[PDB]
Ligand SMILES: CCCCCCCC/C=C/CCCCCCCC(=O)OC[C@H](O)CO
Ligand SMILES: CCCCCCCC/C=C/CCCCCCCC(=O)OC[C@H](O)CO
Ligand SMILES: CCCCCCCC/C=C/CCCCCCCC(=O)OC[C@H](O)CO
């Protein structure tokens with residue numbers, strides 16, 4: 001049950017960026033998105049990923065590796081003339 | 083060091099929403115922000131909060147209670163456009 005809530009919470013925050021990734025490319029707008037947010041966020045999951053390794057905490061390990069991918073795509077789009 | 087990394091990682095992702103909160107209210111624009119994202123993200127941090135309790139994992143407990151506040155503000159603004 002500990003594990004169930006971890007992987008569902010992990011799924012939730014991770015796949016939450018997908019509607020955001022989609023919105024960016026379909027609407028071609030990043031204007032309202034904060035650069036400072038995703039930048040600050042990008043370093044966080046990296047430190048979260050390391051924390052999870054040192055913690056042997058898998059739901060946060062899995063969550064942060066996939067979230068990094070999602071966040072890097074939104075970050076990329078925002079960084080290029082947005 | 084685990085804890086050092088726990089609380090900085092916590093600070094980074096949590097305090098990351100503040101630049102977004104400010105941007106929202108100062109520009110008065112939320113068009114590009116995804117509602118499905120923040121709705122989905124909101125349920126997540128709550129579920130992370132319980133997970134953090136069950137883990138006795140303090141940085142993940144603290145991080146998610148503070149983000150919950152931040153995420154609720156961006157969500158309100160997004161919901162009221
Ligand atoms: C006050 C007249 C300008 C004064 C000049 C000094 C800067 C003062 C703050 C303005 C934005 C500076 C950005 C740093 C503050 C973060 C809030 C933010 O929205 O940053 C936007 C960022 O580019 C995400 O896209
Ligand atoms: C790849 C697209 C080609 C075909 C398009 C037809 C189906 C798309 C439906 C429109 C959005 C409906 C919401 C469902 C999509 C979830 C992600 C999304 O961006 O929704 C925006 C939401 O209203 C704010 O967050
Ligand atoms: C210590 C426990 C913290 C846990 C967190 C509970 C999360 C559930 C709701 C969050 C309330 C957020 C309150 C935000 C207050 C400002 C809301 C705001 O955005 O006001 C906009 C204004 O009204 C536009 O006209």
Ligand SMILES: CCCCCCCC/C=C/CCCCCCCC(=O)OC[C@H](O)CO
Pocket residue numbers: 157158161162163
């Ligand atoms: C820790 C416990 C502390 C408890 C204190 C927490 C206070 C948070 C209050 C906000 C709830 C109301 C927020 C509802 C968001 C806006 C809803 C609304 O305006 O609907 C817009 C509609 O969706 C347009 O289409």
